[PDB]
Design a protein around this ligand. Sequence first.
Ligand SMILES: [Mg+2]
Lengths: 117, 118
Amino acid sequence: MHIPADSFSGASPERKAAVALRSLFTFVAARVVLEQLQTTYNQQAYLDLMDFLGTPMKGDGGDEWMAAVMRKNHALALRLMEVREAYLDEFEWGKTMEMASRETREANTRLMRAAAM
Amino acid sequence: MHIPADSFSGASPERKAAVALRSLFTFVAARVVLEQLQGTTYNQQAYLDLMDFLGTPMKGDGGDEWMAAVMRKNHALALRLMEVREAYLDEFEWGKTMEMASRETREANTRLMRAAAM
Ligand SMILES: [Mg+2]
């Protein structure tokens, strides 16, 4: 029997980061779809997306925002949902980890060198 | 923590996320150290200074402008904050974070699909 890796957390920096990532993916999806867009239905989708991009995602991973988009333009919301889910397989989280780690070490080294005698 | 506004315009989403995480780790470190300082005259001064600096933003650069400011005031405190934020790299549950983000993205899409299903 396979016992699955622990992937649960309550209030934690990991949860904070996870929700921030979810909002990032929703934003990325909006940008991807905007480029796709830039029929009469497609012109309206473009107008709607531009309107909705004018307002910030609440810090809930983009879901209040997405529900609002769906109320106005279901076809557009379906496309944004598809793209943000597809993006999960494209986002190079390992690279994010490498940069965050390497650049912390580099920043600490720079600061320590600057003050060193 | 609004990742699209982090790093520079033109950065990848991955780089924006990395810089945002760096700022998060700096903040986490500061909270850790503050707690430690509450439960020596130099130790009292580090507490006083940390309380002051937590009153100010670490806008950018992953907390490094903030850290340089701390170091100018209190080098020992900056060394400790640097140590903790670097140590935190290996404490942070990287895999869990991406899996939660991924799973909850799928779940949110499913919730919305089920809601529009009529
Ligand atoms: Mg298609």
